[PDB]
């Protein structure tokens, strides 16, 4: 479990991803949630930043990722870095 939000980089009160082997953690506000998830929750690294479909290409520095239809510099990283 990472100790800093994968979206914003800072620490504090973080929620953890339930996908198998995902160590990524997030603030609620950085995800657009007001309360902790109420069942199995998968974090945004796993789904396309455009359409929400399962992602195939992944930023290693933040949860931006894209599916085949919508997919970066070089580990690969997106614009924010
Ligand atoms: Na994503
Ligand atoms: Zn955050
Ligand atoms: Zn995850
Ligand atoms: Zn997509
Ligand atoms: Zn990124």
Curated annotation (Swiss-Prot):
Quaternary structure and partners: Interacts with HDAC1. Interacts (via PHD-type zinc fingers 1, 2 and 3) with SALL1. Interacts (via PHD-type 1, 2 and 3) with SALL4. Interacts with NANOG. Interacts with OGT. Interacts (via HMG box) with NKX2-5.
Instruction: Name the domain of life.
Output: Eukaryota
State the name under which the record lists this protein: Histone-lysine N-methyltransferase NSD2
The record lists the lineage as:
Eukaryota, Metazoa, Chordata, Craniata, Vertebrata
Q: Where in the cell is it found?
A: Nucleus; Chromosome
The entry's family comment says: Belongs to the class V-like SAM-binding methyltransferase superfamily. Histone-lysine methyltransferase family. SET2 subfamily.
Q: Where are the zinc fingers (PHD-type)?
A: 2-49
Tissues where the protein occurs: Widely expressed. Predominantly expressed in thymus and testis.
Disease note: Rauch-Steindl syndrome: An autosomal dominant disorder characterized by poor pre- and postnatal growth, facial dysmorphism, and variable developmental delay with delayed motor and speech acquisition and impaired intellectual. Other features may include hypotonia and behavioral abnormalities. A chromosomal aberration involving NSD2 is a cause of multiple myeloma tumors. Translocation t(4;14)(p16.3;q32.3) with IgH.
The record describes the protein's role as: Histone methyltransferase which specifically dimethylates nucleosomal histone H3 at 'Lys-36' (H3K36me2). Also monomethylates nucleosomal histone H3 at 'Lys-36' (H3K36me) in vitro. Does not trimethylate nucleosomal histone H3 at 'Lys-36' (H3K36me3). However, specifically trimethylates histone H3 at 'Lys-36' (H3K36me3) at euchromatic regions in embryonic stem (ES) cells. By methylating histone H3 at 'Lys-36', involved in the regulation of gene transcription during various biological processes.
> What is the protein's species of origin?
Homo sapiens (Human)
């Amino acid at each position: 479990s990472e100790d800093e939000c994968f979206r914003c980089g800072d620490g504090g009160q973080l929620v953890l991803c339930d996908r198998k082997f995902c160590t990524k953690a997030y603030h609620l506000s950085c995800l657009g949630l007001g309360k902790r998830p109420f069942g199995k929750w998968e974090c945004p690294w796993h789904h396309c930043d455009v359409c929400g479909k399962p992602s195939t290409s992944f930023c290693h520095l933040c949860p931006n990722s894209f599916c085949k239809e919508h997919q970066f510099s070089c580990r690969s990283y997106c614009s924010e870095h």
